[PDB]
Design a protein around this nucleic acid. Structure first.
Length: 189
RNA sequence: CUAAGAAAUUCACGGCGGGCUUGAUGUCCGCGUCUACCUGGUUCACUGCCGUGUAGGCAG
């Protein structure tokens, strides 16, 4: 926990979008700025969620610095949510701070994924494909997120994600492109 | 302690033949239904993605 980039921000109310109706736009306007724009000294955390309540977004919680995340207060790439949101700037963090566990990982729940794999790897079709394939091992990761409707359909798909524990020690460096800890202790202030 | 107490009705069969219901007719007349709006139900709690084995870049 060497960085001291805590930038808090709040929400804004709008009538033309639900939580997914701006969460899919957040997934569209954060990943490309973290990919085509990029920056390993910039990301996000998830320190204010819950399991049963399904709290996905409740406040500004980012991880930046004096130069890498210093363009998070003069950025016209996030312009348009002035009817539904806002942002802040980084503040001086203290010595003893926490570090929450998160992950922006991909969970898979295919019970017929063995059949779609064997269609190009085994030739075992759907007729005899119920002998030893995983019928219920492909579980679902139920959690609250936005409903990103890709070309498969217009319905709101669930945003699977795994939380983590809380350790007093920290780990500075780099995480995945989504900000979830792929080896690095994520921030939770 | 009951008008108490008891009991075998048996057997058989030809209803049958006939027939003109007819003819007539005006249902007329009238009408303002009127205003109002946000499905991305998740047209599967996830399709389809490197290992059929629990870690992942994707149209998110």
């Amino acid at each position: 926990m060497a960085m001291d980039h805590y930038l808090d921000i709040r929400l804004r109310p709008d009538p033309e979008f639900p939580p997914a109706q701006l969460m899919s736009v957040l997934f569209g306007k954060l990943h490309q700025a973290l990919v085509a724009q990029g920056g390993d000294r910039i990301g996000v955390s998830f320190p204010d969620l819950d399991e049963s309540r399904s709290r996905l977004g409740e406040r500004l919680r980012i991880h930046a610095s004096a130069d890498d995340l210093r363009a998070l207060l003069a950025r016209p790439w996030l312009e348009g949510l002035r009817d539904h949101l806002q942002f802040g700037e980084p503040a001086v963090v203290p010595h003893p701070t926490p570090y929450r566990q998160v992950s922006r990982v991909q969970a898979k729940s295919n019970p017929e994924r063995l059949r779609r794999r064997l269609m190009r790897r085994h030739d075992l079709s759907e007729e005899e494909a119920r002998k030893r394939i995983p019928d219920t091992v492909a579980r679902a990761l139920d959690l609250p997120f936005v409903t990103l409707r890709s070309q498969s359909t217009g319905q709101h798909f669930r945003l699977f994600i795994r939380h983590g524990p809380l350790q007093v020690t920290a780990e500075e460096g780099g995480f995945t492109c989504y900000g979830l800890s792929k080896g690095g202790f994520v921030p939770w202030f």
